[PDB]
């Protein structure tokens, strides 16, 4: 088994801590959802190759521009997250997060991940967003942003229902294994 490093970036409420928790426990916690994620080394086998994938979070580091880049050394794959219930989180992807990740992680593949895909068909989400002349992020809007920023690929998932979670991490492992 080869060792690879994954770091997830994105705005404070993009759901990146919940995504790492649900993958690492292989379950959406029934009793208590942790506030924070320390780290984890997942055993993953993708396309016949065994990899130990170390998982890291940047939650808490969003307002600290000198502490945050300390998470980036030797990263093999980046998961750049946004929340599908928050079109404002997608707007900050090319403005702030993309120039940062391209500077500290040159040539590292980036996967743009649309989180909370379950809220696209949530009536409370739809009513709330319509009060700010908005709607949940459309699948094509996510694909077009990933295409624009030079992402390796675009994926969607729901940490709440577990749908798409496993696929994101197996694909991240494949991206980390490339050239």
């Amino acid at each position: 088994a080869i060792r690879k490093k994954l770091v997830i970036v994105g705005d404070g409420a993009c759901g990146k801590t919940c995504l790492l928790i649900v993958f690492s426990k292989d379950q959406f916690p029934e009793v208590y959802v942790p506030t924070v994620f320390e780290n984890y080394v997942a055993d993953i086998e993708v396309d016949g190759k065994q990899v130990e994938l170390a998982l890291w979070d940047t939650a808490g580091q969003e307002d600290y521009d000198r502490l945050r880049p300390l998470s980036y050394p030797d990263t093999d794959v980046i998961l750049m997250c946004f929340s599908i219930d928050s079109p404002d989180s997608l707007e900050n992807i090319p403005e702030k997060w993309t120039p940062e990740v391209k500077h500290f992680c040159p040539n590292v593949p980036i996967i743009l991940v649309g989180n909370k895909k379950d809220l696209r068909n949530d009536e409370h989400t739809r009513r709330e967003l319509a009060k700010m002349k908005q709607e949940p992020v459309k699948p094509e809007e996510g694909r077009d942003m990933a295409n624009r920023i030079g992402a390796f690929g675009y994926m969607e998932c729901s940490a709440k229902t577990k749908d798409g979670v496993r696929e994101v991490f197996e694909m991240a492992t494949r991206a980390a294994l490339q050239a």
Binding site: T35, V36, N39, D57, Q61, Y64, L67, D74
Partner: peptide, 18 residues
Amino acid sequence: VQECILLVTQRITKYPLL
């Protein structure tokens, strides 16, 4: 070794969230 160093660095920014 490298993981312990990043665990320590990230500890302080876990405090406001908790």
